[PDB]
């Protein structure tokens, strides 16, 4: 039976919408995190067989941004590279697909994760037939391909409203969660707890280079009071807001995968062993519920009980969905997103899953936690989870 | 573990802005997913996941593979995703699904690709705003589909790079291009695309239309019409519109499950996937990709090139295809025996699935035991897969 | 003494169908041909022109001051001046009045005035300086936004036409009859050769070959009442205004060469007529189709003429509804109005149309020996313009 | 012989490109100016017969923005309104066209001037035929329709270079002229000499309203070094720079006209009598020279010697051309642009002629100057000039 480990991991800092990485292509963030995982494990880029990168918004970035990130990071032309999209779950799914390359004896060494620049996502219009008369729409690919449900036509925060309404979650419980997430994240940030996992990214300029190594979306000094001031963002009589939903963000995150025997040959002390993963579908109207069956399915594959977990990363798309998952699964809230979650840190879609996985792995190392789980809800109604055990 | 293609279908390939000009990728996809399941006698609710290659999803809305999956009646309980190894995606998707089943993560996968090159939008990054001066609206089909990221030239320059390395004449490529069209029109009229094709109904306020014939194929392709073309990518070059593939829309897919499961279901499978591989090569000469990827596939399959009874070798260009034939040295009589992509079309993300459909349906038709399918990929890669009939 | 300005010569292009003969012909190219024509027809050299004044509503993307481009192409010397203006549909006729003014005030002696438009070449646009930080945005059709949508109510000109239909209680059958009659008069005029004199042929250059355009391509031959009756209302589901009883989207240019009556006489020119009066008046934007009514009345007052004194009238047909309303109110003999058909048939190249219908008026007055004529048009945003012309 | 007076005048402050009026439609600036001239004259909007506004870049603003300005200002629906374009000359030419309406007996009271929002000018593409395959250009209407010569394809700054070379104008002379403009305009602004002309414009905003009543393009404390440091903008061995050229700017300006008799009936002390005007063509290659023949012709028509002039506003498109004009005409530089010119104040194309007219009229009144001239050069090779006498 195969046994495949995460030798090393790294992520950029998460940028704010049109913030520090306003003009930085996804593959540029990508390339930095690929070299980082390689440098962090002591493996030469020339030893990478394949690079697999989750990416949702690749339009106008040119052929196969995954190969562009690979090549820029000095992975040789002889390797291969590709991109995939299971939306919010992409960056974590790519890690599982990579494990599969190795488990099936198709590859010995894989870099997998996700990259996303929501800033650089273009506006678009189908224009071949030509517009003989009348206005036409220039469509925001970020919104269209990222945040709009393809079946109901409404946005993801409307699905959060559905989940909020199902689980009867008050504005106050969602806001209390929100401020909790920010507070946890600003603590982690100041306490230095993101330094291990973040690789500085340098933003080249004519005016001068700017090194980015801090998560800029975290609100310092978030108060309940500030939270309670905001209007509902998707339903005039709704409870979801910009304060209790994640944001629009840019980042990359990756992990270096290989067999347990290989890490041991190379003297690598891996960050974890992938014991299981799972993906499952649910109603797109309540996609926030995804992590409930996916986590349960991952745990079933891992042969674990929910109580076995020492650390969880359950992605925070919206406070409504996040509370609901925590409610349903019944895991100790104190072990969930202990350094804050996406509401504070941001949600760079295709990278999110590799982002939270990074956070899980380094905090597991940090606390000496043995068993851990990452899970995300996925637009269109899915969830993905992955179980990790320390070596 | 032993994973078989239970069934397989593809849409006809449409010419650029032709039959499918205003058809979303995911609708062509939904037709192919349903057709695989119907042909296999498998309930859609039995499907674990749908994996679709697609290179050009801008404007089409969240995760078009799931939109196809849902439009095909696969329940909300299944999963779906898209992937891009450019021209390899459609075949890579099938490898990826086989892995899902090999690792015990799924029982039944629908894998393939879908593309609408006609529906690809123009785009510009516009958040920062253009404070003054002109800007370019970018054809995402060209940028994200056929333009090499590293050198910034089209895929037709690479083919010229390969024409000049393998020293392939303009005569030879026209000999190849006419030969391809002839086979495709022969095969078409002969009724050899019927099995693999599932018809697609294009809905309209003027009337529905049923597309069930490949429309990019030229009838009565003469060398003259080839030799009358000017070079498209270099003023002194040998690559042309006639000895290169087209821009196209279409979809293709396979139903995967274990061999054991196919036997519980009493399904007579189209083939057993014996091996596959992907490999990298100089992006400048990307069309060579099928060489290392077919050799690895074959080494991984424990086969010799002399073992193959049939090969499908994607003709992105005549120069890259001739060169692969030249180096691999297989019998050119068993290669693309019903024509190729120059004749048929190259719907980027579907193409690997396309050429698999053709490979599998013709191995049945003539009773070939072994087949290899292979593609070159923008940026310099090759994918290949080895299919043994049951 | 009170100045007397004549129209020494006039010309127009054939009017092109939307995305038709002139699909890719910039407006100033049409204009250049027409400027060349009026000079030729008057025996006046381009070197003698003082100013060119061209109405033009949709100049976006054509570059700096397309009037000047038209003039320079036509060989008008760099020492002359040229400018464009925009009083919407009224533009081409107002230009002619503004030309007259230049001469009357002693600032010029010889002016080419009229208008030009390429609706087909009108671009789509969007303001993108500040970025679109998130969310979809519209690429606006400049033709629709700047030419055909009311700026105050936000609806299209055809809704204003519905408004007039309703106020004047004009039936669908009445409007349809008017529109068929327009088509049939224009077809008849065309087949008889009555537009030859006014039309200067336009050569559309290509690579595949040149094509000479000298027929109005929008006129429907053999137009049937059934063809009109079958159409759905285009602006109100329970309305009466249709694509068939409205004018179209068209390309074209048209112009007149002006000079003092004394200067014409020196040169030995037999002018097409004397400008005796003009006027422009405003009305409610909601019923802008009504502009011709006060504009005409004022023009006549200023001329010292009664409605009954008119021998010919060109009253522009933006829509059958407003056309009918104007004729009903003014009470002029419909048999003297748009005798060669009107815009429903011929087309409506916005900034050119006033000069176009002036062309038609002048050449018909000449043809039939009519002494007194009037040209009038309604104007988007609630205005009218009218000019009175007398034979000399 | 008819005698037409300018009863009153007003202008907006001139905004910087994408500055104070970045999102203000030209017709909103024009309305405020229309309301102002009416206020200043004591004439009610009900009395206005026609509004005539020069405007070079109306694309996307809707039907006949002149009418939109007139209606917003309360000018009755029975009045009429129209736009015109003779490029830079347009605001001034509008005033002459107004004059003509009165002189020929067609109107009694006219508001004429110009308005321009270079900021709001869109980008455009002809898309009716479709673009079957390949990239296409989105054209900046501001550059295309406002600033590029239609015959030679180069920008107006290249015309200014042509004039530099022909008149042998050093980069030092041009920089000195531009510094002097800035320093004159700063002085005038600090002394309050633009207050009388400027009508404040309220920029409405959710986050509050902003009152704009100072010319924001004027550089305070402009140094010769700052000019000397600049690279030539139009030819690598050129002399014309962003510093010795005017800018891209927003604004409106207008004058209310009536007959001298009508003003006397109303008891109005007018800003000046229109004594003459002229417009002439020159080679487009050297369009900056237009003022030369235009001014000479206007002076001839007025029966005035250049020496007779007490004040001159000669528009400063570029230092090069402004210097050539002054050299040729020979008028005392100390009477020209005494409060600075466009290089400092800005160049809102279709309003600029009316702007400089405003500045002339208010300074003539201020200093008791009897005879004034306003002149501008015009893209495509023309000039326009106007002679004004105090009453
Ligand atoms: C008003 C417009 C042009 C947006 C529209 O509704 O579609 C236009 C059609 C399809 C009705 C077309 O037949 C048409 O051009 N109708 C006339 C439009 C129009 O207002 N023309 C100018 C009349 O003054
Ligand atoms: C002239 C233009 C706009 C094409 C250009 O060179 O870029 C703009 C800059 C930023 C370089 C700068 O020189 C500028 O603002 N130019 C505009 C100069 C101009 O035409 N001014 C009008 C003078 O009346
Ligand atoms: Na505003």
Residue C388 near residue C300, CB atoms below 8 Å: yes
Report residue D207 as tokens.
Answer: 């986050």
**For chain C, percent helix, then strand, then coil, each to nearest 5?**
40, 25, 40
C-alpha D21 to ligand 2 mean position (Å): 19
Q: Which residues contact A253 (CB under 8 A, 6 or more apart)?
A: A9, A10, A11, A12, A33, A91, A113, A114, A351, A354, A355, A357, A358
Half-sphere CA count of C318, side-chain side, radius 13 A:
32
Q: Nearest C-alpha of chain C: how many angstroms from B357?
A: 39
Q: Which residues contact D377 (CB under 8 A, 6 or more apart)?
A: D88, D287, D288, D289, D290, D291, D315, D317, D321, D325, D383
Query: CA of A358: how far to CAs of A7, A65, A256, B16, D187, in Å?
Result: 12, 21, 11, 44, 61
What are the chain C neighbours of A144 within 8 Å (beta carbons)?
A: 136
Residues D65-104 as b/e (b if ≥16 CB within 10 A, e otherwise) read bbbbbbbbbebebebbbbbbbbbbbbbbbbbbbbbbbbbb
**For chain A, percent helix, then strand, then coil, each to nearest 5?**
40, 25, 35
What are the chain B neighbours of D131 within 8 Å (beta carbons)?
A: 122, 137, 139
Query: Which chains reach chain A with 3 or more Cβ–Cβ distances below 8 angstroms?
Result: B, C, D
**From the list C19, C132, C140, which residue is nearest A132 (CB)?**
C19
Q: Which residues contact D191 (CB under 8 A, 6 or more apart)?
A: none
Residue B20 near residue B211, CB atoms below 8 Å: yes
CA nearest to C376, candidates C317, C333, C301, C329: C317
Q: Which residues contact C74 (CB under 8 A, 6 or more apart)?
A: C31, C32, C33, C35, C36, C39, C46, C52
Per the document, the length of chain C is: 392
Whether C88 and D64 lie within 8 Å, measured CB to CB: yes
Q: What are phi and psi of B227, to 5 degrees?
A: -65, -15
Quote the DSSP letter at residue A306: G
C-alpha C249 to ligand 1 mean position (Å): 7
d(CA A348, CA A113): 12
Report residue D246 as tokens.
Answer: 């005017």
Q: Which residues contact B228 (CB under 8 A, 6 or more apart)?
A: none
Strand pairing class (D201-203; D123-125):
unpaired
Burial tier of D368 (Cβ tally within 10 Å: 0-12, 13-18, 19+): exposed
Method: X-ray
Q: What are phi and psi of D169, to 5 degrees?
A: -90, 120
How many domains does chain D divide into?
2
CA nearest to A156, candidates A286, A66, A290: A286
What are the chain D neighbours of B131 within 8 Å (beta carbons)?
A: 17-18
Q: Are residues D201 and D255 in the same domain?
A: yes
Report residue B387 as tokens.
Answer: 């299919």
On whether residue C266 sits in a domain, the answer given is: yes
On whether residue C345 sits in a domain, the answer given is: yes
Q: What are phi and psi of D379, to 5 degrees?
A: -50, 135
What residues does B381 pair with on adjacent strands? B280, B377
What is the sign, positive or negative, of the torsion defined by CA atoms of D161, D165, D166, D171? positive
Strand pairing class (D110-117; D50-54):
parallel
d(CA A342, CA A356): 8
Q: What are phi and psi of B185, to 5 degrees?
A: -70, -40
Query: Which chains reach chain D with 3 or more Cβ–Cβ distances below 8 angstroms?
Result: A, B, C
**Which sequence positions of B are flagged as catalytic?**
87, 346, 376
d(CA D86, CA D378): 7
A202: left (phi over 0), alpha (psi -120 to 50) or beta: beta
Judged by DSSP in three states, D270 sits in coil
CA nearest to C221, candidates C180, C255, C251: C180
On whether residue D141 sits in a domain, the answer given is: no
d(CA D43, CA B246): 71
What residues does C34 pair with on adjacent strands? none
Half-sphere CA count of B10, side-chain side, radius 13 A:
35
Residue C338 near residue C182, CB atoms below 8 Å: yes
Radius of gyration of chain C (CA): 20
CA nearest to C358, candidates C316, C325, C317, C318: C316
Q: Are residues C157 and C229 in the same domain?
A: no
Ligand lying nearest the CA atom of residue D89: 2
Q: Where are the beta strands (DSSP E) in chain C?
A: 5-12, 16-17, 51-55, 81-86, 111-118, 124-126, 137-141, 202-204, 211-213, 250-260, 273-282, 312-315, 372-379, 383-390
d(CA B315, CA B188): 18
CB pairs under 8 A between B and C: 18
Report residue A115 as tokens.
Answer: 């990259």
Residue A387 near residue A370, CB atoms below 8 Å: no
Report residue A313 as tokens.
Answer: 């990363």
Domain boundary among D246, D274, D302: D274
On whether residue C134 sits in a domain, the answer given is: no
Query: Please, what is the Cα angle at B65 between B60 and B68, to 5 degrees?
Result: 85
Residue D128 near residue C23, CB atoms below 8 Å: yes
d(CA C243, CA C227): 11
d(CA A277, CA B99): 14
C-alpha A296 to ligand 1 mean position (Å): 60
Residue with tokens 């393809």: A150
Domain boundary among A232, A251, A274: A274
Q: Are residues B197 and B156 in the same domain?
A: no
What are the chain A neighbours of C141 within 8 Å (beta carbons)?
A: 131, 133-135
Check D27, D88, D155, D387 and give the catalytic one.
D88
Q: Nearest C-alpha of chain A: how many angstroms from B278?
A: 7
What is the sign, positive or negative, of the torsion defined by CA atoms of A204, A208, A209, A210? negative
Q: Nearest C-alpha of chain D: how many angstroms from B138?
A: 5
Q: Which residues contact D99 (CB under 8 A, 6 or more apart)?
A: D4, D110, D257, D274, D277
Q: Are residues A354 and A209 in the same domain?
A: no
Report residue C294 as tokens.
Answer: 């006060």
Burial tier of C165 (Cβ tally within 10 Å: 0-12, 13-18, 19+): buried
H or E stretch including D114? strand D110-117
SS3 per residue for D290-344 = CHHHHHHHHHHHHCCCHHHCCEEEECCCEHHHHHHHHHHHCCCHHHECCCCCHHH
Q: Tell me, what CATH number does A325's domain have?
A: 3.40.47.10
What are the chain A neighbours of D131 within 8 Å (beta carbons)?
A: 127-128, 130
Q: Are residues C185 and C50 in the same domain?
A: no
d(CA A128, CA A130): 5
Q: Are residues C222 and C336 in the same domain?
A: no
Half-sphere CA count of D33, side-chain side, radius 13 A:
36
Report residue D316 as tokens.
Answer: 């400063």
On whether residue B205 sits in a domain, the answer given is: yes
CA distance from start to end of chain C: 19
CA nearest to D288, candidates D378, D384, D385: D378
Half-sphere CA count of A139, side-chain side, radius 13 A:
20
Q: Are residues D40 and D157 in the same domain?
A: no
One-character DSSP codes across C333-352 = -GGGBSTT--HHHH---GGG
Domain span including residue D119? 3-123+193-274
Q: Are residues A298 and A177 in the same domain?
A: yes
Query: CA of B145: how far to CAs of A48, A85, B56, B113, B139, in Å?
Result: 25, 17, 7, 14, 9
Alpha carbon nearest to ligand 1 atom 10, residue: C243
Check A27, A88, A323, A387 and give the catalytic one.
A88
Alpha carbon nearest to ligand 2 atom 22, residue: D246
C-alpha C149 to ligand 3 mean position (Å): 20
d(CA C390, CA A106): 93
Alpha carbon nearest to ligand 2 atom 13, residue: D242
Q: Could you confirm whether C378 is annotated as catalytic? A: yes
C-alpha C319 to ligand 1 mean position (Å): 10
Q: Could you confirm whether D347 is annotated as catalytic? A: yes
Q: Are residues C179 and C239 in the same domain?
A: no
Quote the DSSP letter at residue C19: T
Residue B46 near residue B59, CB atoms below 8 Å: no
d(CA A8, CA B208): 55
Q: Are residues A234 and A172 in the same domain?
A: no
Residue A254 near residue A354, CB atoms below 8 Å: yes
Query: Please, what is the Cα angle at C25 between C24 and C30, to 5 degrees?
Result: 160
Query: Please, what is the Cα angle at B173 between B170 and B176, to 5 degrees?
Result: 150
Burial tier of A64 (Cβ tally within 10 Å: 0-12, 13-18, 19+): buried
Q: Where are the alpha helices (DSSP H) in D88-208?
A: 90-103, 141, 156-167, 171-191
Query: CA of A374: how far to CAs of A96, A310, A362, in Å?
Result: 12, 12, 13
* Ligand 2 pocket, CB under 6 A: B 132; D 143, 147, 155-157, 233, 242, 245-248, 317-318, 347
What residues does C376 pair with on adjacent strands? C315, C386
Q: What are phi and psi of C107, to 5 degrees?
A: -85, -20
Residue with tokens 């995967």: B256
What is the sign, positive or negative, of the torsion defined by CA atoms of D96, D102, D107, D109? positive
Q: Are residues B181 and B200 in the same domain?
A: no
Judged by DSSP in three states, D7 sits in strand
What is the sign, positive or negative, of the torsion defined by CA atoms of C228, C230, C236, C240? positive
CA nearest to D356, candidates D165, D133, D197, D164: D197
One-character DSSP codes across C248-294 = --EEEEEEEEEEEHHHHHHHT---SEEEEEEEEEE--GGGGGGTHHH
Whether D133 and B122 lie within 8 Å, measured CB to CB: no
Residue B93 near residue B256, CB atoms below 8 Å: no
On whether residue A132 sits in a domain, the answer given is: no
Residue A385 near residue A277, CB atoms below 8 Å: yes
What residues does B3 pair with on adjacent strands? B258
Domain boundary among D208, D240, D274: D274
Q: How far is CA A334 from the centre of its chain?
A: 21
d(CA A212, CA A17): 14
d(CA C24, CA D118): 27
On whether residue C20 sits in a domain, the answer given is: yes
Query: CA of D166: how far to CAs of C215, D151, D237, D320, in Å?
Result: 49, 20, 15, 10
Residue A324 near residue A163, CB atoms below 8 Å: yes
Quote the DSSP letter at residue A145: I
User: Pocket of ligand 2, candidates D17, D147, D346: which has the most ligand atoms within 8 Å of its Cβ, to mutate?
Assistant: D147
Residue of A nearest to C126 (CA): A138
Q: Are residues C209 and C76 in the same domain?
A: yes
Task: With both helix axes pointing from N to C terminus, report the angle between C320-330 and C292-303 in degrees, rounded to the nearest 10.
Answer: 40
**From the list A18, A133, A139, which residue is nearest C136 (CB)?**
A139
Whether A148 and B62 lie within 8 Å, measured CB to CB: yes
Residue B232 near residue B244, CB atoms below 8 Å: yes
Q: Which residues contact B294 (CB under 8 A, 6 or more apart)?
A: B324, B328, B372, B374, B382, B384
C38: left (phi over 0), alpha (psi -120 to 50) or beta: alpha
Query: Which chains reach chain C with 3 or more Cβ–Cβ distances below 8 angstroms?
Result: A, B, D
On whether residue A135 sits in a domain, the answer given is: no
Report residue D64 as tokens.
Answer: 């006949």
């Amino acid at each position: 039976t195969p046994s495949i480990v995460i030798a090393s991991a790294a992520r950029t800092a998460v940028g704010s919408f049109n913030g520090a990485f306003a003009n930085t292509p996804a593959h540029e963030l990508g390339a930095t995190v690929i070299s980082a995982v390689l440098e962090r494990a002591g493996v030469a880029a020339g030893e990478v067989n394949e690079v697999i990168l989750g990416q949702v918004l690749p339009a106008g970035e040119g052929q196969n941004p995954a190969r562009q990130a690979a090549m820029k990071a000095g992975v040789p032309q002889e390797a291969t590279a590709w991109g995939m999209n299971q939306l919010c779950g992409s960056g974590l799914r790519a890690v599982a697909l990579g494990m599969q390359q190795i488990a099936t004896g198709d590859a010995s060494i894989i870099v997998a994760g996700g990259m996303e620049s929501m800033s650089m996502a273009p506006h678009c219009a189908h224009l071949r037939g030509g517009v003989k008369m009348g206005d036409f729409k220039m469509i925001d690919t970020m919104i269209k391909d990222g945040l709009t449900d393809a079946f109901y036509g409404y946005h993801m925060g409307t699905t959060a409203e559905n989940v909020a309404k199902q689980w009867q979650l008050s504005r106050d419980e969602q806001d209390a969660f929100a401020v909790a997430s920010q507070n946890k994240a600003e603590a982690a940030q100041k306490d230095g707890r993101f330094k291990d996992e973040i690789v500085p990214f340098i933003v080249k300029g004519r005016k001068g280079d700017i090194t980015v190594d801090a998560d800029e979306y975290i609100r310092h000094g978030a108060t309940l009071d500030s939270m309670a001031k905001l209007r509902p963002a998707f339903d005039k009589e709704g409870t979801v807001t910009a304060g209790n939903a994640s944001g629009l963000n840019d980042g990359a995150a990756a992990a270096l995968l290989m067999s347990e025997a290989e890490a041991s040959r190379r003297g690598i002390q891996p960050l974890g062993r992938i014991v299981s993963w799972a993906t499952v579908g649910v109603d797109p109207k309540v996609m926030g519920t995804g992590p409930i069956p996916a986590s349960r399915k991952a745990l079933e594959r891992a042969g674990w009980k929910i109580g076995d977990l020492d650390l969880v990363e359950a992605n925070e798309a919206f406070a409504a969905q996040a509370c609901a998952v925590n409610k349903d699964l019944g895991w100790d809230p104190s072990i969930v997103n202990v350094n804050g979650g996406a509401i504070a840190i941001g949600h760079p879609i295709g990278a999110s899953g590799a982002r939270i996985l990074n956070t899980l792995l380094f905090e597991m190392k940090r606390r000496g936690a043995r068993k851990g789980l990452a899970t995300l809800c996925i637009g269109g109604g899915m969830g993905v989870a992955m179980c990790i055990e320390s070596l």
